[PDB]
Design a protein around this ligand. Sequence first.
Ligand SMILES: Cc1cc(C)c(NC(=O)Nc2cc3ccccc3cc2C(=O)N[C@](C)(C(=O)O)C2CCCCC2)c(C)c1
Ligand SMILES: Cc1cc(C)c(NC(=O)Nc2cc3ccccc3cc2C(=O)N[C@](C)(C(=O)O)C2CCCCC2)c(C)c1
Ligand SMILES: *Cc1c(COP(=O)(O)O)cnc(C)c1O
Ligand SMILES: *Cc1c(COP(=O)(O)O)cnc(C)c1O
Ligand SMILES: CC(=O)N[C@@H]1O[C@H](CO)[C@@H](O)[C@H](O)[C@H]1O
Ligand SMILES: CC(=O)N[C@@H]1O[C@H](CO)[C@@H](O)[C@H](O)[C@H]1O
Ligand SMILES: Cn1c(=O)c2c(ncn2C)n(C)c1=O
Ligand SMILES: Cn1c(=O)c2c(ncn2C)n(C)c1=O
Lengths: 805, 811
Amino acid sequence: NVAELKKSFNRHLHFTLVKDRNVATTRDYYFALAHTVRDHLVGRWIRTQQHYYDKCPKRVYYLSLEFYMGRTLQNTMINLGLQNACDEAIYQLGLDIEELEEIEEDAGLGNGGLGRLAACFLDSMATLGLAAYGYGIRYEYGIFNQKIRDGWQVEEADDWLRYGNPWEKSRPEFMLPVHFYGKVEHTNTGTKWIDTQVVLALPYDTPVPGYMNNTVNTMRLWSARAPNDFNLRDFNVGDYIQAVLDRNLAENISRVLYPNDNFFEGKELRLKQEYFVVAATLQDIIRRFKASKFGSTGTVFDAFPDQVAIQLNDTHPALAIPELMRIFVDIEKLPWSKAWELTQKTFAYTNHTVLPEALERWPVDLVEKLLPRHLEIIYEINQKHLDRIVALFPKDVDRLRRMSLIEEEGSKRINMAHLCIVGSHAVNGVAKIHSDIVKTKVFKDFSELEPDKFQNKTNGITPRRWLLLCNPGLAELIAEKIGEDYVKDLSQLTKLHSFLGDDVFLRELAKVKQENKLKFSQFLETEYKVKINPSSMFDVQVKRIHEYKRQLLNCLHVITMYNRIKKDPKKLFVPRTVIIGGKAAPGYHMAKMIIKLITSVADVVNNDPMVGSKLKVIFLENYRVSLAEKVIPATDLSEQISTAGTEASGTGNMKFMLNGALTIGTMDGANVEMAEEAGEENLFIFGMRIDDVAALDKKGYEAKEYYEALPELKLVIDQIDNGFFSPKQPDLFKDIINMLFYHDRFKVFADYEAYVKCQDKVSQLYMNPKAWNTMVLKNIAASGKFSSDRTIKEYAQNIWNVEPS
Amino acid sequence: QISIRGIVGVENVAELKKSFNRHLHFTLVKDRNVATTRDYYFALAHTVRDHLVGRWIRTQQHYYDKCPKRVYYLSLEFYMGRTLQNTMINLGLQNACDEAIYQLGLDIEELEEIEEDAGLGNGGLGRLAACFLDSMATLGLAAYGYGIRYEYGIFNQKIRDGWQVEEADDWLRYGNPWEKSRPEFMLPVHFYGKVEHTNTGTKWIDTQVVLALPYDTPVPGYMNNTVNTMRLWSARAPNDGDYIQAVLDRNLAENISRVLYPNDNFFEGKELRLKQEYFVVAATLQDIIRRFKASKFGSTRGAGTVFDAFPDQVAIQLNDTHPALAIPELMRIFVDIEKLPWSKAWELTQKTFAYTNHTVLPEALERWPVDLVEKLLPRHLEIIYEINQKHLDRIVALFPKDVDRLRRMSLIEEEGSKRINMAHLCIVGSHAVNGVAKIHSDIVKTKVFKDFSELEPDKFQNKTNGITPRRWLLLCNPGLAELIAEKIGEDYVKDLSQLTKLHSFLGDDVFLRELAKVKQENKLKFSQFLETEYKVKINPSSMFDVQVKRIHEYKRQLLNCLHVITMYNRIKKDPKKLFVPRTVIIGGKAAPGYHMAKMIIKLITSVADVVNNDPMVGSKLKVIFLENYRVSLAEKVIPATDLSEQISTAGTEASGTGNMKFMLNGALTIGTMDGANVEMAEEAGEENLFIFGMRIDDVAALDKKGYEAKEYYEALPELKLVIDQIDNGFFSPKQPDLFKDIINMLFYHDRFKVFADYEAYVKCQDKVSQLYMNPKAWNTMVLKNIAASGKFSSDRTIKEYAQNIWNVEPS
Ligand SMILES: Cc1cc(C)c(NC(=O)Nc2cc3ccccc3cc2C(=O)N[C@](C)(C(=O)O)C2CCCCC2)c(C)c1
Ligand SMILES: Cc1cc(C)c(NC(=O)Nc2cc3ccccc3cc2C(=O)N[C@](C)(C(=O)O)C2CCCCC2)c(C)c1
Ligand SMILES: *Cc1c(COP(=O)(O)O)cnc(C)c1O
Ligand SMILES: *Cc1c(COP(=O)(O)O)cnc(C)c1O
Ligand SMILES: CC(=O)N[C@@H]1O[C@H](CO)[C@@H](O)[C@H](O)[C@H]1O
Ligand SMILES: CC(=O)N[C@@H]1O[C@H](CO)[C@@H](O)[C@H](O)[C@H]1O
Ligand SMILES: Cn1c(=O)c2c(ncn2C)n(C)c1=O
Ligand SMILES: Cn1c(=O)c2c(ncn2C)n(C)c1=O
């Protein structure tokens, strides 16, 4: 088995890379290994498809504009049971497998939580044997690579396909046309959408192997191509060369991921992406349905929602609803009511945020020009929707305004969330607190009519990538005590509760953490030229840079610690390495300022000789999935400090819990449920809760009162305001200060005192290894709920109506 | 050739079947139950490429170990066609692969037709490069081809309402199983910026950078151990307003290798074209220098790398002036980067480069505006000026009284907008300059660059073009290849001169029959193709009269067309008279901006509609415009041909290579004494070709006197009828004035004197008709043509370059 892996490796280096070992590159070796590994799942990949054809299980289609997949090599080795053998084979060839793994580019086709949920789900659905496909866009450039230059974020193109992707297979025989612009004619043979521009969607298939089973599912991502055929409407002259160059304009549709996290930008190219992935995906689903054993019978499509479920990852693919209607009515000649019944039973919608700047509201003018037939269909859905509300509440005219899919205020906009609610048989939030707000407040008018529609499905993370892969030390240690059933049923981690008084096991737990810390410290000293204190608490905040996630609040605490040290250098101080990391959306000015502040603080703290090894600050550059795997297992304190009510769930919070970090955080999103499972006393909960925030909004938030009432806050803010951290540019952080005092929607100062006292309690506990690791163990033992396997089981039972196999 | 019989032969087929099935499973990721013909083609291509990896690696090892002088064919074009069949044959695997595919239940022909042409060329220039690579591989020379990996080759041509329309040749849509990317050899290329003159010397600063990423395609030799390489460069944006627009604008850098400029024998001075030329030249020279430094002949001394041995290790052939920037680029690297003195660097440059001239037509000549070059390549403009100055100084020293000679020999044309004459740059920067046939090389030497060759008589040479007898006989015409093998053995494939041995069968009627049958079999096959693509009933006993080449005023498809109408008019005039029936096929792409060429296509299709549908004509005469003429199609139609039309005006066609393909494939030639036609006449005997019309002195005499087209129109009744028909709307009844531009050119601006050769052409055609009625006499002449075609093997051509230009030896 080791011997055969070596032969296979050498075959690929030879035949696939056309390389003698004498001129072989590190990248060649990565590619030879990658192909060797992929060969081992082809059999099951082809047989998984046969199985789905022969037995016709209901299929699940996860439709997302993002899949934040990270690297595939190590994950595939783990899920196929080949890691130990591949490591040994590569070692025997005089090579280091970790070095080959670092060659691989992240498939960074996502922004943050939403896209990473899609990735974990694919892994969970494959492990649970569901007939599930992921459908998205193969962006030529994913989320940008982040560099820091002079303390500022700078963006470089994520050219991830430069050298090829060995994990994908293009299937141009399954290419599909997508239409744009044109016009509508309502003829006597039906409605015709004509004079359209066509863009081709070419699918690329990546295998999604289950963990130690016979399932290999598919992720199918679409790529834009210009069509080749001459239309008699191209008779119209132009330069030949420019016409060929202008093919770029069609191909631009799948060129780059929009790097906005929780923020809507109403750009036309983005709308095209949304319809692009949706039109190609639905056509492909219909083609597979018709070619299946339920493809003939009276109309073939009566069995459709028994054979197809399509999950909408946020409102980004909301156009799927009117497109399915369009295909049913205009092309398949089904009557409206029938089509509409089938549409609702096919689609479910997942809501990921209640922040108003994230909500998709497309101007009707833009949709009219680009997708005239879909506007007509949307207007019709709304008409029949509003007729019913006038029928049920004749006197309530304002309710019609609130429940319409169209917002009429001057420039008219389509509310895509309302489209997703009326077009779906089920709508879910991603944590209890969030799903509650969704149902009872934000879509109150919709839930009162249809209470059974709105559900909760709390998020989760795959314990393959986020334990087995990223933290083998912990995985091995856990498996040695309670066996390895926990991988496929993470609720088994509760059996670790037995070892709470096992002092030898607590030393061994702490040692695994220590080894993870040593190794990441090396990474940090290689990359940042900063001397790391090995016995310091690794205090880590990693996530996209946002005002609501409040990296800024963390930063105020960093300066507070700094100042305390300067005031009394002889005083006892629990040493920390504070790591803050994450990308700012390029056009997000305040996020970019916060980054600059953090790097400005770090430079002052890291180089102050009075501080030395007590406090080091690192801005972690280019935070992404594969770096997430490095830092999270090395963490002691997980910062999850969003203002109560703002973070729908979080998922990084769960990753840290699973890898032996304690959480400091607000009662927000999934933090509440982490407290529920682990016991509130075993997290470091602080600050305002959702009701306390509501009470401060009512009363009116005055930031100045806290700055005057809290001496340590004043010195921190003054240092920032008067140039202590930017001596050559004293006024550099003016935009931040202004925001804090006059426009802070997230109430940083209001939680500052509570946050700082909480941080003191964390330091106390860190001085007591037995107490700390006793608490860590209760966290790990209670983390089973947050496996995405549990999540998918609930989606399967209560929404998709499908069964693990 | 590898065996399919025995214990070992059975195991060869078995192994090919297993490999086929491995690739369909592991590479294509397809069960047989959902596999398509395209999947089967790829599975086979992968299998076939696998079989040359061993030799490809060993060839590179041998070149590293024995360190011979390396040859670098540098071209903007490689018109390669399809690779699958050509590789199987050259590897000796066709019989075995055929057998494997057959046993798997598949149609080998159907799999072969799936393959896209690598149509990265316009015509003869691109195709000569292609033939040359095959020959250099077969002769065992350490040669690389260097080009651009165009995302789109020459456009696919379709005909709509009688006009050419262009569609993008999206040849990489389904991938390319032959190439291998080599990311580690990615190189930077610089553009724009400016020149700084400082204490440390000249710096080229503020440049925008474009990345060149090479892709390698194997070039297998015929039945030897050599697999050489074609390295083609692809343009990429470097990883270093609106973020999204910044990402989208990476397209601008990648546009450098997006599309092939579809001009044949015509200079279009576009900035994107200039970029392409510098791109391929900069990437290539860097990569060549890198290979030189890393080899056993790469030594070190006080300054740095000794490039003393560079010209004994490196020969670079410039295929036309397109990569002329190679000369100042090498000088830039030598002087600006490697710090060699100008004198030494200039001497090494001359010893390294050789230049091949392919056309004397003024409109084809590359003359780049100094303003464009200054903006794009400012340091290269300085180097060109410096080269020119030192070049003029020597001429002033030698000929002090001749003020005009300086003007004529300058690399700069100074009137109006100043332009860089790239041919002059190539002559002074190279130690050898060659034309592509005797007639043409003589014009290059004694007339066009008379001042240059007088100063350096040993510089100018001839190297008459050739074609590879692999693709253009063994591959395209297995029937004829087989027949020749039966009669004289298989040694002709490696020594084409052995075709003269076929003279033993001169009076042998059995063999003359056998030769006719092969031609008939090729005609029957090609007739099928024709009848499924065009609404025509092909007469199978008709003479196949073919003119396939790019549409040009100088190649005179129009003349062919005038003769077609003449024939039509003769049938109408005397319906019951004896007519030797013909299928007249004319095919070729027009450059998209070539107005007159497009009009000529419209004329031909318009004429075809009349002739094909006139019931009085019937099966006597059919006209086909063959759509989308390209290499793989040339391989179908050439073997099916009886008469080859090579009717360019005397002195315009530098060589021609189609002429050679037709000769080798059993067709007789009607043509002028132009290009290699002269040498075809020399080899076969002039009486065995149908030579007609003005020769080069006759065209000179007519130019001096002045050409009055109307004198021929008035003097020749039959021409009058033809021209009046076209002018008055006989062929465009719904648009009577449609061909007004053609008439206007023919009468007042015809640089190629169509009417001047009409009389001699039509009379010559009558003689061809007469001979075709006598099978015994017709095929006797065919035999003397095939038997005399050995000279035109590209092997012969390459040995001559090697011995006289590159100073390397066949192995
Ligand atoms: C164009 C090309 C073709 C092939 C087939 C390869 N891959 C190889 O494996 N090439 C080589 C294999 C060797 C095996 C033994 C000894 C020497 C070998 C050299 C090569 C090779 O390609 N040579 C280089 C890369 C070359 O450029 O020819 C070499 C020149 C001498 C200095 C070291 C680099 C490759 C890579 C390319
Ligand atoms: C996404 C994907 C994955 C794979 C692994 C393949 N390649 C296959 O070989 N797929 C199939 C193998 C089968 C083997 C036996 C019986 C049925 C099989 C079906 C497939 C298959 O994937 N079928 C298609 C392509 C499917 O996508 O379900 C189906 C689509 C509708 C038209 C008829 C073909 C492929 C091709 C894709
Ligand atoms: C887990 C993950 C996220 C989500 O992080 P949150 O703290 O829940 O917002 C974002 N980016 C990457 C790379 C991740 O792995
Ligand atoms: C050989 C060839 C040519 C060159 O033909 P000429 O008659 O010499 O101009 C042009 N196009 C193709 C496809 C060829 O194979
Ligand atoms: C728009 C968006 O990405 N929302 C995010 O979705 C993920 C996955 O549900 C949540 O963990 C997170 O709280 C939420 O902010
Ligand atoms: C610029 C160009 O493509 N010239 C062409 O070159 C080929 C190959 O040398 C000749 O056969 C042909 O006569 C000539 O027109
Ligand atoms: C104001 N603003 C932005 O401008 C922005 C953003 N995310 C991306 N962008 C551009 N967020 C979250 C934001 O609040
Ligand atoms: C005038 N003209 C052109 O304009 C042209 C051309 N080949 C391409 N083009 C555009 N030729 C040969 C030509 O004579």
